[PDB]
Structures are given as structure tokens and as C-alpha cells.
Structure 1
Amino acid sequence: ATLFIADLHLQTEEPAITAGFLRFLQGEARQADALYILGDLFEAWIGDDDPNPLHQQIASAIKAVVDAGVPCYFIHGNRDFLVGQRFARQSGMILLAEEERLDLYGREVLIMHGDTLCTDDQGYLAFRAKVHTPWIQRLFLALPLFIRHRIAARMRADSKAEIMDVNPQAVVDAMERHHVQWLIHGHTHRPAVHELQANGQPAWRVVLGAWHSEGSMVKVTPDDVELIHFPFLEENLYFHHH
């Protein structure tokens, strides 16, 4: 089985999500054929030279899965688009492009984070165009770490002062550009299975859920596609009247 997760938004202020991800990496991920992380693994990223200890804890936990024989892949999200090759080497993950076509047990599946499908939020897509410009990234990464920390903290507070869903035609355009009947993405935080038509045949868009109160993953087997929700920590059972 191949596993897909996204929108974990890991941060030191949310240790329960971190503990759930570590339990997921030590358990379910070890039995998988592969693990794909489709963006927004971290709530924020200002560069691989960030000494945030959470980054090294996550990197060593993913590396343990990679050392256990499970290849791990990463597609950038809107929050952690600055994740680079330094963290990829520390974690053993392979960085993929914003759109990838996979062969999962015979069926061709398109994977992406999903923010590029939300073409109705032109305010966001302008922001995305800027921060994805290579010379803007090189200039930001050259700034000192404490400057980058203060830039990110101010932009988060300013953005805090409602995620737009995908555009239906953008979905059709992507699945026809890649000639696929299956699409998996996250970003929108609306876990669902949508039926549509692409390339003159029925197609399906599978959406991952954010790790808010419980975990979320998509499991693709040769026999089916599964959207699975599970608790973060081990919910130890313990023991009404007639």
C-alpha cells in the first residue's frame, strides 16, 4: 500500500500533532511501499539552516522510515515552499515537482499539493507568484536567520488579521494535461472523494484532510483507494448500566 498525507502544519506549539506524526512514522508508515507528503508538513519554513529542534526531530523520524526500506517523497505546500535539499538529505526524503504522475499498482494518479487548483483566489496566487520567484527566494534565504524569523512572524500575524476551494475547470485541465482519471491533493482541508469526468471518462479527485484533531491519510492499494482518519495517540481502552 502507498500512503499519502498532507496539511499536518507541524509546529512546536502543537506537540500533540507532532506526537501523532511520530507514532504514524513508527507504525503505519513502516509497512507502506512508499510515503508521499503532499505539502504543508510544517506550519512555517524560513530555510533549511533554521536550527528549530522540531525540524531535526522530524527529519530523524522520517529518516528512520527511509532506513526501514520505505521511500519517502515530498511535494511543497504553500506554507513550507522553502524546504530544500539540505532538509531532504537530513530526512532522506526525495523532493518532487509541484505536479507528479505516479503509477500506483496499474492506475495512473496525479499528485500535487492543491493550491495551484484554487484559481479563484487571485489574491493568493499573486502572493504565490512572488514567493516562488527564484531570485526572491535567493534574496530571502540570504537574509540573516533572526531577520527571517521576524519577517515570518510578522507576515503570519498580518495574515491572521477560510481557505478557498479548488476551481472545477482547473481540476479538469490538470487531469487532462496528465491524462489521468485519479487525482490526490490536499491544501483545501476538505477530505472528500469527488467524481467528475476527464478525458471523456469518469475521474476522481481525492482530497486529504488536515491534522486538526485526528490524523488523515489516503491509502492506495491494488484493490481500492481509502481515505482514513485515525487518532493521534494510542487511545487506551478502559471501562454504563442496564
Structure 2
Amino acid sequence: ATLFIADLHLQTEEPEITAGFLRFLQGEARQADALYILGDLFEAWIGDDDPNPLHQQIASAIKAVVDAGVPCYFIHGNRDFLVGQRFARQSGMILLAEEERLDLYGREVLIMHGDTLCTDDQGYLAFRAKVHTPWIQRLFLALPLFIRHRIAARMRIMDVNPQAVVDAMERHHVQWLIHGHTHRPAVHELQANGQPAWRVVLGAWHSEGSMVKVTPDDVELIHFPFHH
């Protein structure tokens, strides 16, 4: 099976979610063919030089999975778009583009975080266009750590636009889309490419985790409580 997760929003203040993630990594993930993390792995990210110990605990847990023969992949979310090549290296994770078209046992599937589908929030889209500008990023990342922390400190979810969904599945000519961002776990049926299509939406990790499990014959969205 190939596994997809998203919207863990991992942080120092929620160790319970972190332990549920580490349980997942040490059991479920080890049996998989591949693990894809579709963004918002972290609640925030101000650069790979942050010495936050949570960041290394996570990179090490993912790296163990990678080193067991299970490739892990990462698509950025809106929370963690600054995750960079040094984190990739520490984690063993391969950074992917904002949209990837995969081939899972013969089935073609589009993966993305899902924030780009939220076209009714121009407030957000304006923000995203800015923070995706490389010179703006590199500016931020050139600041001393202590100034970046204070900038984030200061800065303290629209559903998808149905048409944006259809447009994305039609650009890639796919009948399957997996995404997160919206925190509304569900399987949807629509039409794309003159045919039945499915959009599978992952949940955020709070009381429960969620994953999409793709096998040769089946696609399942699975929720699991943190009970052990």
C-alpha cells in the first residue's frame, strides 16, 4: 500500500499528536511501499536552522522509515512552505512540487496540499503569492533566528472552490485527487474529463489521525483514534 497523510500541525505544545505520529511511523508506515506527506507537517516553520528539538525528533523518526526501505515524500503546506533542502537531508524525505501526478499500481492520481484550490479566499491567495516569491523568502531567511521568531509571534479555513477542483483534475487528466488543507475528511464524487471522478480529503491530526491507503484494487480514507 501507498500512504498519504497531511495536516499534522506538529508543535511543542501538543506532544500527544507527536506521539501518535511516532506510533504511526514505527508501525503502519514500515509496511508501506511509500509514504507521502501532503503539507502542514508542522504548525509553523521559520527555516531549517531553527534548533527546535521537535524538528530533529521528527526528522530522525522519518529517516528511520526511509532507512527501512520506505521512501517518504513531502509537498509543502501553507504552514510549512519554508521547509528546505537541509530538513530534507536530515529527514531522508524528498521534496516534491505543489502538484504531482503519480502512478499508483497503474492508477493516475493528483496530489497537492489543497490550499491552491481555495480560490474564494483572495486574502489567502495574495498572502501565498507573496510568501512564494523567492526574494521575499530569502530575505526572511537571511534575518537572525531571534527576529524571525518574533515575526512569527506577531502573526498571532475556506473550503475548496468546486470549479478549481474540476480545473485541476482536468489539467492533469486524472480521475483521482488526494489533498488536505481544509481539515474536512471526506470522499467526494464529481465529474472530470467527461467521467466519474473522486477527490479524497485527509483530516487534521487532533483526537484522531487519518490516512489515505492506496492499493492496486482499492482507495480507502481511514481515521484512527490515538488509543494505545
TM score, norm. by length of structure 2? 0.98
Aligned-residue offset at 1:205: 0.4
Other-structure match for 2:170: 176
- Higher alpha-carbon deviation: 108-117 or 222-231: 222-231
Instruction: String of CA shifts for 1:105-134, please: whole Å, max 9, x gaps.
Output: 111000000000000001100011111110
Residues 158-213 of structure 1: per-residue CA shift (max 9 Å, x gap): xxxxx100001100110010000000000000000110000011100000000011
**Which residues of 2 match residues 1-242 of structure 1 at below 5 A?**
1-156=1-156, 163-231=157-225
For 1:92 and 1:181, the matched residues in 2 are separated by 30
Q: Give, in whole Å, the separation in 2 of the partners of 1:23 and 1:73.
A: 19
**CA deviations over 1:200-230 (Å, ceiling 9, x no partner):** 1110000000001111111001111111111
Which stretches of structure 1, 4 residues or more, deviate above 2 A after TM superposition?
none
Whole-angstrom CA distance in 2 between matches of 1:11 and 1:2: 26
Secondary structure in structure 1 of the residue aligned to 2:213: strand
Task: Tell me the secondary structure at the aligned position of residue 166 of structure 1.
Answer: coil
Unmatched runs of 5 consecutive residues or more in structure 2: none
Please state whether the residue corresponding to 2:155 is helix, strand or coil: helix
Question: Structure 1 residues 69-78 or 212-221, which shifts more?
Answer: 212-221
> Residue 93 of structure 1: CA displacement?
0.1
Whole-angstrom distance in 1 between the partners of 2:195 and 2:222: 26
Secondary structure in 1 matching 2:147: helix
* C-alpha distance after superposition, 1:7-31 (max 9, x if no partner): 0000000000000000000000000
Structure 1 residue runs of 5 or longer lacking an equivalent are 157-162, 232-240
CA distance in 2, matches of 1:195, 1:145: 45
CA apart distance, 1:153? 1.0
C-alpha separation between the residues in 1 aligned to 2:222 and 2:160?
A: 22
> Structure 1 CA distance, aligned partners of 2:16 and 2:162?
35
| Deviation per residue, 1:14-50 (Å, 9 max, x gap) | 0000000000000000000000000000000000000
The TM-score, its normalising length taken from structure 1, stands at 0.92
**Structure 2 Cα separation of the partners of residues 127 and 43 of structure 1:** 17
Aligned-residue RMSD, C-alpha: 2.5
